[PDB]
Design a protein around this ligand. Structure first.
Ligand SMILES: [Cl-]
Length: 102
């Protein structure tokens, strides 16, 4: 899979490694998986069901908030974008997107 860039973030799937402005980030494999999947669909909503299966290998239930917890942890770990945008947007029910540059 190809290396993806968003803002100063670089996602290299060949190493399952994320870097920001040239510095490697301390991400779990699960975190990397989630980031890369959202970045492939940059600016478009990815379903909770798809994220649950692809990132966690499990079927979504209405009481499982693990993907949102991953987003919470990612928002703590990721430096602020140079471009000022959020990294993510939550679309209630529909899932999450990684925010496009404008
Ligand atoms: Cl964000």
């Amino acid at each position: 899979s190809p290396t993806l860039e968003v803002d100063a973030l670089v996602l290299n799937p060949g190493r399952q490694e994320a870097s920001f402005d040239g510095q490697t980030l301390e991400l779990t494999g699960t975190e990397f998986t989630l980031l890369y999947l959202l970045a492939q669909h940059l600016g478009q909503v990815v379903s909770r069901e798809h994220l649950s299966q692809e990132v966690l290998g499990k079927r979504l239930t209405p009481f499982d908030h693990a993907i949102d917890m991953h987003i919470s942890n990612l928002r703590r770990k990721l430096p602020d974008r140079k471009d000022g945008h959020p990294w993510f947007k939550t679309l209630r029910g529909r899932g999450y997107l990684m925010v496009s540059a404008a």
